[PDB]
Amino acid sequence: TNDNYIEEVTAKVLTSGKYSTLYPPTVRRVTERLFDRYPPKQLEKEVRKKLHQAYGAYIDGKRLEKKIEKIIHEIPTRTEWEKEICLKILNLHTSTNERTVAYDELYQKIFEVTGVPTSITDAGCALNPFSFPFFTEAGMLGQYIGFDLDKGMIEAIEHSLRTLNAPEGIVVKQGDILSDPSGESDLLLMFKLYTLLDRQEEASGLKILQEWKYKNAVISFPIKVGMEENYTVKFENDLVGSDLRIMQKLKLGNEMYFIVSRL
Numbered sequence: 001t002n003d004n005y006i007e008e009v010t011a012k013v014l015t016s017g018k019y020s021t022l023y024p025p026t027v028r029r030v031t032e033r034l035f036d037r038y039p040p041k042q043l044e045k046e047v048r049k050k051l052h053q054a055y056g057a058y059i060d061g062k063r064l065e066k067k068i069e070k071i072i073h074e075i076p077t078r079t080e081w082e083k084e085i086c087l088k089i090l091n092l093h094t095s096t097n098e099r100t101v102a103y104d105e106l107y108q109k110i111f112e113v114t115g116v117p118t119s120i121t122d123a124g125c126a127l128n129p130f131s132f133p134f135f136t137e138a139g140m141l142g143q144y145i146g147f148d149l150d151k152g153m154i155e156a157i158e159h160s161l162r163t164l165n166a167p168e169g170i171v172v173k174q175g176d177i178l179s180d181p182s183g184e185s186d187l188l189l190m191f192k193l194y195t196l197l198d199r200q201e202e203a204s205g206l207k208i209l210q211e212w213k214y215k216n217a218v219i220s221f222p223i224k225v226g227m228e229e230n231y232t233v234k235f236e237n238d239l240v241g242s243d244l245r246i247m248q249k250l251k252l253g254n255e256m257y258f259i260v261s262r263l
């Protein structure tokens, strides 16, 4: 039938070890999206290209977990000690590395505009869940739900959090903000993810910020003459037509943080 090519192609690429460590609904999404365009044939070659174009850079947690096992073994007021371990963990990836020397006041700065929330949602969280000594101290004692695309990374975060005896409110899982049903949060975090979304699906960043329900959302961008496209102003120009309001524009470290609210 019509719905059988999708389930067959989705399973045919999810079976291949090249594309098995990613969220199946994403493959289910790009196959259903590329179905009307291209003919029934070439679909696998068209989805494996789209996956390579968009999600090809996030396909293992083995090396990461052993990297984190070293950090928690190399160490002998204790609240400050647990930070210096999370900070060394937050330095493994370039994503959360530059945010160091800013995690000390990042959640304080954000909560000055939004208030201490009851729950934080982190889309494409990556290593950001390990910033829990900073937002729990900032007042956020609710449930933290961070999700990402690569399975192996989420497994590495899950096991490392239990080894740290982190609060059981710090939940990690796998998910895609473009294919999972619309969520609801007291504070949605899109740290260095908005521009990534517009590559995977055209004009999807503003769509997610409009479809998702949140009291407040924080969308961040890097800062880094004139040989790289400036995408911060691109986002500032994207919000002219929407009913989304910029409540505050925080510049911390090498990053710009936009606190967006729809009321």
Ligand SMILES: Nc1ncnc2c1ncn2[C@@H]1O[C@H](CSCC[C@H](N)C(=O)O)[C@@H](O)[C@H]1O
Pocket (backbone or CB within 6 Å): 058, 095, 096, 123, 124, 125, 126, 127, 128, 147, 148, 149, 150, 175, 176, 177, 178, 190, 191, 192, 193, 196, 197, 200
């Ligand atoms: N559609 C999507 N839904 C959720 N996470 C996604 C995604 N597309 C990419 N990601 C993830 O988003 C992350 C972008 S890098 C930035 C990670 C983190 N927000 C930080 O600021 O350090 C990667 O982990 C990537 O795999």
